[PDB]
Design a protein around this ligand. Sequence first.
Ligand SMILES: Nc1cc(-c2ccc3occc3c2)ccn1
Ligand SMILES: [Cl-]
Ligand SMILES: [Cl-]
Length: 330
Amino acid sequence: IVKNGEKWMDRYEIDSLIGKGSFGQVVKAYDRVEQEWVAIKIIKNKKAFLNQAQIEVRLLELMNKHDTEMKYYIVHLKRHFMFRNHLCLVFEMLSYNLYDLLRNTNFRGVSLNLTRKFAQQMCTALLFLATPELSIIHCDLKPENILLCNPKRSAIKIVDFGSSCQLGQRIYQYIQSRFYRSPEVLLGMPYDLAIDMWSLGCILVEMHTGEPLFSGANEVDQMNKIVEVLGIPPAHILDQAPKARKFFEKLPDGTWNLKKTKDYKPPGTRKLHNILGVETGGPGGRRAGESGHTVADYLKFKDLILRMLDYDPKTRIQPYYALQHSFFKK
Ligand SMILES: Nc1cc(-c2ccc3occc3c2)ccn1
Ligand SMILES: [Cl-]
Ligand SMILES: [Cl-]
């Protein structure tokens, strides 16, 4: 839609394409007023994308009118305007995303120490979104949506509030990227901020192993891969779940089991202990003997992840309590 060298509103000079989304495109541009480069998110000229992007603008502006040390893990929306019938969101420039970081490791993962730094910033971000007057559910956390602030540094920010909603302003039943989709969403249940913490747990294991924890090809495969690691979800959750019978079957004695199709490891036998290599030199043993990768370091990480992957969104660890975990103690 946009040429390089093109000038908008005697303010912005378009340089190049940064990225394309379902929403439209992101371009690098020079702002002559501030005298800085910015990223402009250009929404498609169609009602569906316009209306959802108007929600993104509202939630970013809501976040910006809160000045607390907790808010600086969200990309900064500088302003927005309408141009040629496209809503245009102007952000600060950021660097490459955590998927690019994994790709750059040949999908062998970053160190437990770099994983910890990401975890601590993401947990702080989620604590900010949980502030009562915000209560923002990101709904699409994944490596692609976490960007480095600076290619020399390990500071990150979350981008893409395109799926996001406040608690009690849910639109879609089917949300989150499948690999990072919470059990409560797979099961058709009303969701709250705890779905982001599920995504985060998935993301942190992936950042350290190089590979997605739960790479379902569809929702049935997704839930089966979750069950391999974490077992059958508890009956009290399945009993209240609209879509339990998409994946599970209830038995005479009021118990639940997998529906099986034609031929997964038996429920709960694919141990996070072994995925992480807690006692076997880390993922594929590639961290054997490296500092900051002892059994004790690993056990703390495993414990925090298993708390983030609680099936029960009620007892799943919350951002403040995640920040107090031993994994983050020097
Ligand atoms: N909210 C939002 C923000 C971005 C965004 C914002 C700044 C950026 O700098 C480099 C890439 C990049 C992408 C993309 C999509 N949604
Ligand atoms: Cl991915
Ligand atoms: Cl979504």
